Design goal:
It is classed as oxidoreductase. The structure is a homotetramer. By secondary structure, the first copy, chain A, is an alpha/beta fold. Chain A has 16 helices and 19 strands. The complex binds flavin-adenine dinucleotide (4 copies), chloride ion (12 copies) and sodium ion (NA) (4 copies).
């Protein structure tokens, strides 16, 4: 079997859909091939909250942002290990990318709602209607059907076709036991995401990312795009830069949204009954601290007073039922009960909370310098939850320029090969700021399809 | 009609009940005479939250307070216009007074709950069961009945009886049109409270305390004790030092508890549609600012987001129904609606909230330096409330020493005359810190009855 | 003897010179009569630092101020007891007043230097060349000589001349034992300053302003203008609102500039060897706290480390020589020496500094919440200084409107009578912010002369 | 040539001298072999400031520290990548190590002086007399001569002698072209320091540590100990964790102490005339930001106002003369001059400083959130300096247990082989806190000699 298009995009996430739509919009034949039976990848189960400095939503609310502030926030976030030109091009194209989603893809964002992720000087993350990436992916596939962009599911790319001159001329994929050849007259776009769900690749670049980390993403995020491109001598950088989330379900690895009480006074307790880290540190700092505790897990503990402010138990009854059923979460009346259900030394826990109560009563956390201020925990009932970290984002990946052209190890452009999204590795640095991944995949996805189409 | 006791106490508030119980406990005949048909005065409708440094409740929760911190908090609160010896004696006797209420009067405080009023470095205010002064007054009258302390209601003291030597030998009161003579063999205790409900006396020492201020207290607080004592040449000081609460009902003058959203993001708006004061300033600073606005009133405005955190609308449905019925509070869907219901200039209000939204999105209130941080007000619905200040506490009053003995204008002790509670004027200074009035009346009430009984 | 002018100005300070120059500029005869043998009054010995929002100096440095911020800073500073219309007119005319001094009077301000007084959200106080009011007064008298504005020194106004209709028609003054009559065809301007140097008038409106307060001003500031105007039934308000400076020479009453180490780590110690107030509180709060300590004085203590940062000893050798000669300041090698020279209990002082050293080593002042952070005092040598407060500014005075017209007790305009400067009492409220007095006297001085000339 | 001792220590730094003295103190023959012609290594040119929680100096000053705070400060500093047992053993033995230096080695620390490095909650770093490591090394060699500990300079260890059973039985060294055999009957101690001066080894574990980084250390710090131990199959970990200092001389690589004005208001400017990083960020964050600027260097700029507070120009005249002579530092009168001497775009620099002046005048750095507050730079003269980062500390190295026993790659103890100091790699993590390296080398140096001697 043999297909021939101008642009062959691998991956039906946000990056691939943007590349595919821009290629078709330029008057070229394109196709998206998707390995999974469903479209969307991690972009589907994502919050799809998009950081934009100068958005129409900010103007509606009276918020004045700045592109240079957005740029410096992102660079300082990755400890200046990110590429300044890649960050600048992302920030400079964020407004146009968000307006493109609103006007071309018909994505509906909330007009009077934004979120401020950690490390952002100004609240700037747009929120899609429904607080889900499905709003974006549904509008993408609807738009793709209107413009005639075919999406081939259950089609796994396995080999890049390189001709005598070194130009990438197509993709060899597997569909229904059979070898499909995808001839790409103009370019191939690699939009395959990261490898957070590839434990053996994780260990290769960081032996500590073994079973003590879960994955917050889908099963398909296995880094196929990096292995494919490297076999034709593409460069990969920063493969060890990995973003984690510290409070995840030990069973599934998913982010434990019921433990968002951490932002309202919840404390992290280890098996000894002690606090060990500021609950509002960087996500990677908290995960590393959790892995230094006995057993490599932590407890999350709060009371009704905090729930009356956070409402995380009320807003996430599914997690409440699952965690309690699996024996990883209890609701108890007293701190003594909270200790015994998890065999925490009672006297050491009572003394720990007493210190928290004192820190709350004087405004200073003498133990870990809580930057918001601890909250009294004298009254119950209490919720106590057991959590472990999970790998969230692989900042490393393929080496590209600001035109998404893939470079080899000497830094030379590989003709016909483009990459955008989490599969690239030059934008974020050592820490991926919240809401920045979606700005990255839409901005560079659009560029990839525009560059591939010429 | 003629009565003869050892100690005659005027006033059945917290100060009088403490004096009466201590006098009877010393083996002397005593009586409390009360002008109103009910007992309790302002102590009854009070929150009865009592500031104590070193209380058993603090120890239960692990909080470590300090008496010197409590002393310096109180002195700095009244801008060091209070008497240092009066503050020291109050703080040094706070633990014994609170334990006396718990052990002798059988007052029930919460074991795991405290409140931190403004200006207190450590959370230290005890809370009675039920969050009401009725818990204290009910236990007082029960204890008074057990120990044989008669309380004569509908008996208004009108003249102090002074003998040839200048000693105060009794009280002349009015009961049922008739003149009752109360012979006091050992002492008279003046425990009549303040004059927050005496508008003409308020204007005498501050012409600005006219109809633009309400009263948060009961009708009986009219300063009878100061006029009585001054006619036998007792000294009064600081009569102009008055404590106000800025957000009160324009109809009743009571504290508007539904407007506690001020501590969660609610903004104060004047008739022009502008903010004019930091919403977390001192209570006297906010009241003075409110009286500088057009009409001498202010608006309080918040939204569902704040109610989801403050719950003040849910916890005070009575105020919601009354304020809305009286046309002083509206729930609306949009800010445009919030402007029109009170004829606030719409464009100026929309621009004001836009600035608040920007201040919330950047953490800095460039207009009034909100010390907690403003909260976004882009989404509705909204509550908007009209409020005016009310006189809350008259810090001035009779001149006493730390033994509650009343002094004349040369500072000499008037024999047989004692005073305790809000009727005295040397403890608090220019600003009465929250929870400090109850520590004052119990500590010095007990001293008055002990000194009067000898 | 008899003189006849259009406008007769009483007082050769900043307010009078502005009124006199504006009257002459309008084509009218004017005269300034001065009681002292020298011109300038308190405006001469002043720092002459002038608060201006939107000044050319701010623009030179890149600082963006706001008039509404300036207005709200001033109003919140006087606890909203100031007149909002008087503050608004002062702030709105501050730029024009400062430009008038620079362009008409030829006052030289520094182009790249400003000062930020307490309570100002933005650094906005202009600084005259030489850091002295003599720069302003010298340029005033030079300009007055050029425009023909006669100044009569040794001429004390003692009575306002009021005609049959109630119009103020002139001034009766005393010069060389003889009664001079000053006929004022258009108006009289009262520009006599405050009464900080009138102890008996101070006690009249505040019995606490006796010998325990000095005066930072000149001997002529005795409130003659208020007594004069009140005898023709002018209104005076807020006479008890007084501004103090806490750290002054006990001998002279002048501000102790060598004790500006307070802004760099110096601590205030009482006779018991203890701290008693946050060293960075409001000036009135510190003065009141000083008067609550044993003896009604305080000690100021710092070391070479602070001098290496503050340089106050180096920059004020005159005060160093005078205070040391008078036995009110010592330089010692050890804290033990610092205790014995003033008979401070040594053990209590050593423990106090140990607490300061701990507070400095942890960043939190647990005793008084030092808002800048204490500085270690382990090493010497040390300077220790004895200081007492002094009355600095009398915010009260004559009642005027925003056109400087004097009002009677019913609030009615007294024809021909105007007042400007510290002699008026409606601008500042309960606390006069630094740099605001000079904006007040120039803005309203100019208005007085313009209104008097018509 | 052949020598036989019980313990053979390689390296005459702080770690080796501690091991050697403890071995001799246990009654065993020992020797220190030193590759350089001088003793001391990096410990000699070090500040020798030693972090100790609970030191006698803290007690002298009244400072109360905590070992658990010290532990959590160190762990959070290295982002919890350090070994918790290695940090705990260091902190728990810090007091005994410092007292050992004071009492046994006779090191003189200041009794009333400490320093607080970044990331330490309490000021805790002891300071040796003279502010130099030479105070420690001089006392070490004096003590070594008294106890008979021979030190062989110009003797470079090149091969570890391993016997048939795998036990490390001695050292083969080179002295004067000849092969010296050092038989170690009990143990060998590797105390060779780090590899900050080994550029090719630096690039091996981090290709970015090339010529754009200097070295702040001596020429001998070339990682010989790691290569030696790895050839007998010892494990090395974290070799990429490197500590940098951002402001160093481009010529020598030494830390530019004259640029300590950064802690007083100095700003970092790139070639474009812009700020690019908060001047008070982490040292690694600033270095990475400097390498992202045009040319991979930065400028440091301050004025006389800051020098009047920092005194860094006055205290470091040698650097002033050298940097100016080499054309890497200028003193100029105006900002225009400061731009032209380094060909910085003048208009962009003037606008940058104007923003700083505004940020200083309002207290908020809107561009990079300066945590101390910027300082006005309107007036000159100015100093402007060109600086580049240098590698300061190699946190990685040999794998040991808390008894300094070297482990192989399966984690098994290699008999007779011990290591202590910067040559080990498990203590500090990703960021070496200031003053922590000296606590590490003394505590584990002592342990090494005690363990080697048995
Ligand atoms: C739970 C969660 C919440 C998140 N929330 C946010 C948020 O609020 N804001 C934000 O900015 N970021 C968020 N992120 C991260 C962000 O959404 C992702 O980094 C981003 O969606 C990556 O998009 P992508 O198109 O590059 O990859 P993907 O969306 O993962 O697309 C890759 C696709 O390619 C397919 N594919 C892979 N290999 C092959 C192959 N060999 N052949 C064919 N197809 C292949 C995959 O199956 C997948 O469908 C979140 C992530 C998670 C897991
Ligand atoms: C709504 C409200 C809430 C408060 N909450 C708190 C709080 O949480 N914490 C706190 O510390 N303080 C609080 N206060 C203040 C504090 O409760 C009062 O200052 C205190 O109760 C005064 O007690 P008292 O015994 O001195 O006076 P009162 O309790 O007022 O007693 C005086 C009594 O004497 C009677 N009397 C007066 N004149 C005569 C006369 N001529 N003859 C006979 N009887 C006479 C009066 O009728 C009255 O019954 C609150 C006050 C109010 C109004
Ligand atoms: C040491 C010091 C420093 C200060 N620094 C500052 C500062 O930096 N910034 C700031 O804004 N403010 C400052 N002030 C305050 C401010 O300078 C004064 O409030 C202001 O100068 C008052 O000016 P005026 O013209 O109203 O009064 P004055 O300048 O005092 O003028 C009044 C004049 O009228 C004369 N007079 C009085 N009665 C009579 C009479 N009956 N007949 C004739 N003449 C009479 C007086 O002798 C005097 O010459 C300072 C004050 C002092 C004492
Ligand atoms: C300028 C500077 C200032 C510092 N200031 C501080 C501070 O204030 N506080 C702090 O805690 N830390 C500070 N440090 C860091 C700290 O001093 C060092 O990490 C520490 O001194 C390392 O000691 P060491 O004994 O392990 O290594 P070193 O002191 O370097 O000793 C190693 C010795 O072994 C020798 N050697 C190496 N290889 C061989 C071989 N093959 N054969 C024989 N001999 C060999 C070397 O020549 C050297 O003499 C500073 C470092 C520098 C560069
Ligand atoms: Cl085909
Ligand atoms: Cl398009
Ligand atoms: Cl890499
Ligand atoms: Cl009887
Ligand atoms: Cl009793
Ligand atoms: Cl009074
Ligand atoms: Cl004439
Ligand atoms: Cl003019
Ligand atoms: Cl008045
Ligand atoms: Cl031998
Ligand atoms: Cl020893
Ligand atoms: Cl490693
Ligand atoms: Na990536
Ligand atoms: Na009172
Ligand atoms: Na005045
Ligand atoms: Na190391």
């Amino acid at each position: 079997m043999e297909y021939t298009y101008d642009v062959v995009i691998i991956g039906s996430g946000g990056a691939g859909f943007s590349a595919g739509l821009e290629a078709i919009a330029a008057g070229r034949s394109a196709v998206i091939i998707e390995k999974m039976p469903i479209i969307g990848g991690n972009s589907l189960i994502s919050g799809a909250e998009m950081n934009v400095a100068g958005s129409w939503v900010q103007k509606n609310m009276g918020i004045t942002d700045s592109k240079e502030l957005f740029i410096s926030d992102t660079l300082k976030g990755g400890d200046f290990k990110g590429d300044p030109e890649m960050v600048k091009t992302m920030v400079d194209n964020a407004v146009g990318a968000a307006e493109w989603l609103r006007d071309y893809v018909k994505v509906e964002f909330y007009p009077d709602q934004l979120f401020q992720f950690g490390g952002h000087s100004v609240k700037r993350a747009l929120i899609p209607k429904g607080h889900t990436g499905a709003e974006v992916i549904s509008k993408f596939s609807i738009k793709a059907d209107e413009v005639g962009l075919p999406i081939h599911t259950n089609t796994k790319a396995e080999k890049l076709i390189q001709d005598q001159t070194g130009r990438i001329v197509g993709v060899e994929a597997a569909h229904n036991g059979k070898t499909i050849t995808y001839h790409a007259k103009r370019g191939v776009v690699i939009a395959t995401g990261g490898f957070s769900s590839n434990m053996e690749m994780r260990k290769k670049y960081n032996p500590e990312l073994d079973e003590r980390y879960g994955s917050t993403g889908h099963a398909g995020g296995t880094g196929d795009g990096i292995v494919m491109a490297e076999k034709i001598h593409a460069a990969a950088k920063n493969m060890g830069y990995i973003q984690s989330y510290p409070i995840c379900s030990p069973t599934s690895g998913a982010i434990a949204l019921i433990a968002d009480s951490r932002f309202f006074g919840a404390v992290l307790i280890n098996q000894k009954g002690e606090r060990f880290v500021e609950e509002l540190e960087r996500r990677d700092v908290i995960s590393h601290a959790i892995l230094a505790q006995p057993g490599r897990y932590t407890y999350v503990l709060w009371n009704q007073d905090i729930e009356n402010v956070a409402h995380t138990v009320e807003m996430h009854q599914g997690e409440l039922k699952e965690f309690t059923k699996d024996g990883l979460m209890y609701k108890v009346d007293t701190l003594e009960e909270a200790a015994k259900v998890f065999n925490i030394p009672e006297d050491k826990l009572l003394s720990t909370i007493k210190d928290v109560n004192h820190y709350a009563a004087t405004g200073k956390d003498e133990a870990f310098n809580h930057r918001s201020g601890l909250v009294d925990l004298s009254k119950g009932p209490y919720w106590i939850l057991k959590a472990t970290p999970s790998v969230h984002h692989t900042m490393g990946g393929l080496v590209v320029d600001t035109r998404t052209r893939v470079l080899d190890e000497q830094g030379k452009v590989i003709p016909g090969l483009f990459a955008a999204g989490e599969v690239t590795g030059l934008t974020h640095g050592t820490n991926r700021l919240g809401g920045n991944a979606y700005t990255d995949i839409i901005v560079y996805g659009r560029i990839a399809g525009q560059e591939a189409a010429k």
